[PDB]
């Protein structure tokens with residue numbers, strides 16, 4: 001039964017239901033995957049706290065106050081090991097780069113009322129500009145791929161909007177580009193930041209996808225070797241990876257929309273008895 | 288001078304330069320705004336650490352080790368005050384919701400190799416699906432606004448793709464909707480989480496814009512009053528706010544593209560001597 005509703009509303013409802021099921025399944029998987037590690041780490045921390053309390057003769061009240069003070073310090077940008085100044089010009093540049101790309105690592109956060117108000121306004125404008133930049137970069141990359149494909153075809157036969165690349169081809173190119181960027185960034189990060197290669201790849205995916213957990217943040221140590229060049233390389237790699245991964249997300253979203261249309265059509269056609277865009281859309285008028 | 292380059296490449300270059308200038312200016316403003324508060328907080332932490340070291344007769348080595356252990360505990364999900372289980376089913380649902388929407392608060396992060404691999408794959412697929420969902424929601428809201436405007440016009444004259452709303456109107460509706468959602472969410476959060484109203488508004492903007500700093504995370508205390516209803520309300524409000532703010536970002540990006548075209552045209556026309564989309568684009572072919 002079609003349900004006397006249009007195709008688009010059915011697509012919206014199906015996508016919402018699928019996302020809810022995906023969230024439930026992912027939550028179950030993650031819990032079953034690392035609840036034990038959580039509990040072990042908590043028990044280890046409790047053992048360490050008890051040992052420290054016994055070994056230096058302090059109750060839990062003074063230790064609680066000290067830990068609260070240290071939490072305030074960390075929120076202010078203090079770490080046990082050496083860390084770069086949090087709100088110098090370079091640190092502020094890192095912070096605004098994280099805000100502008102909606103990454104938000106969290107190592108640098110505003111702590112003043114004026115700071116937070118300016119964060120709101122600046123983030124609004126900059127995030128809009130950055131989404132526009134990502135869309136423009138995706139369009140430019142698609143045009144480049146089309147031009148290169150045309151040139152290669154003309155060279156092959158000798159030996160633009162006409163023959164444009166398909167969605168699958170662009171998705172494959174974006175996938176391999178993201179893999180290469182992540183591999184190079186991890187190759188740089190592993191011997192510099194001291195992380196493992198897998199940890200570097202995980203951080204690369206976290207930063208590129210604009211998730212920005214904040215557990216791993218690059219270029220945060222107080223001093224580096226060739227510090228300016230390292231910072232420039234880190235910025236370039238993060239920007240390139242974020243652009244590539246965002247374009248990949250958009251292309252996979254197009255593919256998922258195609259798949260959603262297909263499954264909706266199949267269910268409407270022969271699965272009922274078997275129980276047992278905005279640019280040409282909203283920008284077009286304002287022109 | 289046009290520079291014998293097409294309009295789109297010039298638009299890309301101008302946007303990149305403007306974003307670089309915006310980043311530099313924002314970094315300067317943020318640094319000048321809160322470097323003093325940073326330094327004051329750091330000095331306060333140093334004073335507190337020295338006082339604690341003097342008052343209980345411990346050197347800096349044992350305190351350094353204790354603070355490193357506490358940092359590991361916090362990375363494991365331990366706080367000085369009571370906090371909910373980090374990787375139970377509800378906590379895992381919160382985590383996957385943060386990952387799927389690219390918010391990434393950071394209070395819950397994977398700590399196992401399999402956890403990180405599944406995070407990579409699940410985040411890829413879910414973020415693609417969620418970007419598609421946000422685009423579909425924006426299209427549906429635009430259609431709803433068009434239908435409502437048609438009905439209101441027909442009622443007014445009595446007393447669809449034809450008369451569609453413009454970009455300015457949709458932007459204004461999205462702005463007021465985001466303001467209302469943020470106000471309601473702050474009204475709920477202020478007496479529950481204990482934050483100030485301005486802090487609640489700041490957290491609302493941070494979460495809605497998918498920045499997710501992680502300094503403020505809602506529904507993290509161990510126990511609440513009507514805990515299930517509160518969690519449901521928090522989820523609904525965060526989802527609605529994220530959708531609205533993302534749509535607002537896209538609309539403002541369209542407006543910024545219009546402005547960029549205008550400034551490029553003006554500079555090409557009469558400012559030289561004065562010195563002193565993807566859907567109809569890439570999805571169209573694959574259909």
Ligand SMILES: CCCCC/C=C/C/C=C/C/C=C/C/C=C/CCCC(=O)O
Pocket residue numbers: 178179182198201204205400401404407
């Ligand atoms: C940034 C996106 C691109 C990511 C490209 C790489 C992602 C794939 C994951 C790499 C494999 C990691 C090997 C680490 C060793 C763990 C043992 C095998 C665990 C398993 O396999 O069960």
Ligand SMILES: CCCCC/C=C/C/C=C/C/C=C/C/C=C/CCCC(=O)O
Pocket residue numbers: 113114117120465466469485488491492
């Ligand atoms: C989520 C996006 C919508 C946000 C809507 C509200 C944002 C505007 C900011 C609200 C004003 C905050 C008042 C706090 C009191 C500070 C004194 C004035 C500081 C100043 O003004 O210099």
Ligand SMILES: CCCCC/C=C/C/C=C/CCCCCCCC(=O)O
Pocket residue numbers: 090093094097098100101103130133219231232234235238239242303306307
């Ligand atoms: C081509 C110019 C850039 C235009 C688009 C910019 C938007 C994307 C920038 C996001 C960068 C995120 C992290 C940057 C950290 C570098 C700071 C440093 O360690 O020094």
Ligand SMILES: CCCCC/C=C/C/C=C/CCCCCCCC(=O)O
Pocket residue numbers: 015016017019020377380381384385387388390417420506518519521522525526529
């Ligand atoms: C209409 C169904 C949803 C479909 C789209 C879902 C994508 C957006 C969801 C992001 C939610 C972010 C935070 C959720 C935290 C709630 C967890 C809890 O405190 O319990």
Ligand SMILES: [K+]
Pocket residue numbers: 102103104210211212389390391497498499
């Ligand atoms: K984020």
Ligand SMILES: [K+]
Pocket residue numbers: 103104105106211212213214391392393499500501
């Ligand atoms: K974060």
Ligand SMILES: [K+]
Pocket residue numbers: 102103104105106210211212213389390391392393497498499500501
């Ligand atoms: K984040």
Ligand SMILES: [K+]
Pocket residue numbers: 101102103209210211388389390496497498
């Ligand atoms: K984000």
